[PDB]
Design a protein around this ligand. Structure first.
Ligand SMILES: Cc1ccc(S[C@@H]2O[C@H](CO)[C@H](O)[C@H](n3cc(-c4cc(F)cc(F)c4)nn3)[C@H]2O)cc1
Ligand SMILES: [Cl-]
Length: 138
């Protein structure tokens, strides 16, 4: 419904207690999805389900600084399914992003980019139909 790739501005950046909720449906035969919490050209937090990396499904998380990707953090718990609706909740906590999918905790990503108020947009890309993307304070 929303056009992908989608940019969700995060006015004034992120802050602890800010909850981002993404609702969508994975396309049939999906290959990849990405969320990119961006600080200008840098990617503070890239969250990247890969449906077929050497015949394995894996979530890759990383940070991009000055156009260079850093050390990957990988999670083989893989809650996405081709053709199926999902909910991603990203809660900003003081020391990490905390991600739950379909109401089940999935992973945490420690803040590498520490200027949280400069992480002022979220990109949503890849092989989904995007239903909604929003934020609220909890
Ligand atoms: C030295 C080296 C060699 C290979 C790599 S591979 C690289 O790995 C990164 C995480 O370390 C990112 O995942 C990166 N990436 C994915 C997407 C992307 C994903 C979507 F689902 C949709 C879309 F539109 C774009 N954009 N950039 C990938 O190219 C990295 C370093
Ligand atoms: Cl990818």
């Amino acid at each position: 419904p929303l056009i992908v790739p989608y940019n969700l501005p995060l006015p004034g950046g992120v802050v602890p207690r800010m909850l981002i909720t993404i609702l969508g449906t994975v396309k049939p035969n999906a290959n990849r999805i990405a969320l990119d919490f961006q600080r200008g050209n840098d990617v503070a937090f890239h969250f990247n389900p890969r449906f077929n990396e050497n015949n394995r499904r894996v979530i890759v998380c990383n940070t991009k600084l000055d156009n260079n990707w850093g050390r990957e953090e990988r999670q083989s718990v893989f809650p996405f399914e081709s053709g199926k609706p999902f909910k991603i909740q990203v809660l900003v906590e003081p020391d990490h992003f905390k991600v739950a999918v379909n109401d089940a905790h999935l992973l945490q990503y420690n803040h590498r980019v520490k200027k949280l108020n400069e992480i002022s947009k979220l990109g949503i890309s890849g092989d989904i139909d995007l239903t909604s993307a929003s934020y609220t304070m909890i």
